[PDB]
Amino acid sequence: ENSVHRYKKEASNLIKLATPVLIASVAQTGMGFVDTIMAGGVSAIDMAAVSIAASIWLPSILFGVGLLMALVPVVAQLNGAGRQHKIPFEVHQGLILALLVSVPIIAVLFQTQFIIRFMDVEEAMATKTVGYMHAVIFAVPAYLLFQALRSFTDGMSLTKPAMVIGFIGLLLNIPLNWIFVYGKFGAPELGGVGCGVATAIVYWIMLLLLLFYIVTSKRLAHVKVFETFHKPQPKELIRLFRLGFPVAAALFFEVTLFAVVALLVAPLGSTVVAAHQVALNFSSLVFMFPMSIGAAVSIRVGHKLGEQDTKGAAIAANVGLMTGLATACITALLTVLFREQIALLYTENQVVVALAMQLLLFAAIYQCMDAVQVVAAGSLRGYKDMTAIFHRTFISYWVLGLPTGYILGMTNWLTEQPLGAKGFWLGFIIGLSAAALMLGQRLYWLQKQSDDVQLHLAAK
């Protein structure tokens, strides 16, 4: 029984969802930069790439309130072999909320696009291009919900829909991007105009894999048909909301606070690209890894809490912890070596490269640290209202860290640093550090008793 059934199930359930996600994510980010920067980027005399870039900084704040949704349908708990039914209706509500969110974000979108921050050349271009092509990017969230119930949740948890709309995703982007971003043959449109349509069509498929792999269930069913409005259950959408708040806010509000410190301390030189290229680009992908484990557990631990009301805590949690480590430990190590060329991330000169290389290292440490903080936090706790209180613990990791790790690279700006830039980068590590440990202190909390239903009497 000790671990025999853990490493066993852990093994399965873990990598199970993992591979689908880890790969799937590769799609999102993948198809993302690929058809986007490459095409409408290294095509429109570079004034195309970064264009859509900052542009996307925005479709970033969005994905924010996007996990709002996400956690909502990690509620694939109302399937711990339990109330297998009613879940169809829960969703319908989550999705309705999907719209209720997209629009509040149409706001953000349409208006900032219609005003931007400054003015150079991207403006009209990547701006409204994405403007409406991103009214389209509101149709995604909707999908994102599908994803939530199926892809992500998947009845109980069958995330094949990863590689589905995934491989297909990036794939159909390109041909559809060729033509629209360029390829006339129908209507040739500026580069960033095709990234825009890159996604418009992205949801063509998105909607497809959605309706199809879901209402179709080439395996399960016990699906949807005839849905309705709601205010009370939407007060449960206010449970979805009083969850999506602690998720959307949390992780992505932090996205801003990430850009904050970052930029706040971007006034150091070319060391921008140093730390920027370094940390961001790479570690953004490295994190993609622990993120993958995160949800894997989060749902393995939600379905496991929902069925036998067993110690998924044991399984899902501590495996996640165990493994996430293993990998962020694997990639932390796999990074010390592969720094250099990796460093040669952006195809440029030395530039940081060496110092980039210095940063690369700070990263490994972030990799691993981040990992625990990730799986641990967002998942295990991601399985219920702890999303709320753990968020607290989350933003606590931010103030302590950044304001201090920042003031720690800034301790160079005080005590000292054999490079303060890289330095406070590490200061950030003191962030992920406190966080990871902060959530480890939100450990089961008393472990779990009939208090789990306290999470099902607060989640219903």
DSSP annotation string for 388-431: HHHHHHHHHHHHHHIIIIIHHHHHHTSS--SSHHHHHHHHHHHH
Q: Is there a contact between 377 and 236 (Cβ–Cβ < 8 Å)?
A: no
Among residues 44, 1, 369, the alpha carbon closest in space to that of 195 is found at 44
DSSP 3-state percent helix, strand, coil across the chain (nearest 5): 75, 0, 25
Instruction: Please give the Cα distance from 441 to 377 (Å, whole number).
Output: 10
Q: Is the dihedral of CA 122, 126, 132, 137 positive or negative?
A: negative
Contact 64, 202 (CB under 8 A): no
What is d(CA 218, CA 213) in angstroms, rounded to the nearest whole number? 7
For the record, the structure tokens of 59 come out as 């479709």
CB 140, CB 95: distance < 8 Å: no
Query: Please, where are the H alpha helices in 278-317?
Result: 284-306
Q: Cα(320)–Cα(295) distance, rounded to whole angstroms?
A: 10
Q: Give the number of other Cβ atoms within 10 Å of residue 395's Cβ.
A: 15
Q: 24-42 as b/e, with b when 16 or more CB fall inside 10 Å?
A: bbbbeebbbbbbbbbbbbe
> Cα(164)–Cα(206) distance, rounded to whole angstroms?
10
Give the CB-side neighbour count of residue 75, counting CA atoms within 13 A.
37
CA distance 2 to 78: 27
Backbone angles phi, psi at 17, to 5 degrees: -70, -45
Per-residue DSSP letter, 283: I
- Cα–Cα nearest to 17, from 153, 168, 219, 201: 153
Q: CA dist 57 to 113, 187, 253, Å?
A: 12, 27, 13
Tell me the one-letter amino acid at 348.
Answer: E
Q: At what angle do helices 353-374 and 318-343 cross, to 10 degrees?
A: 170
Tell me the CB-side half-sphere exposure of residue 191, using CA atoms within 13 A.
23
**Tokens in use for 414?**
């005080």
Q: For residues 197 and 130, give the distance between their C-alpha atoms in angstroms, rounded to a whole number.
A: 8
Contact indicator for 30, 170 with CB cutoff of 8 Å: yes
Q: How many residues does the chain have?
A: 460
Residue type, 342: I
CA distances from 58 to 53, 55, 67, 204 (A): 9, 6, 15, 22
d(CA 421, CA 327): 27
Q: How far apart are CA 341 and CA 359, in angstroms?
A: 13
Query: How many other β-carbons are positioned within 10 Å of the β-carbon of residue 257?
Result: 17
Q: Which two tokens stand for residue 273?
A: 């690209």
CB 201 within 8 A of CB 174: no
Q: How far apart are CA 211 and CA 229, in angstroms?
A: 20
Would you call 453 exposed, middle or buried from its count of C-beta atoms within 10 A (0-12, 13-18, 19+)? middle
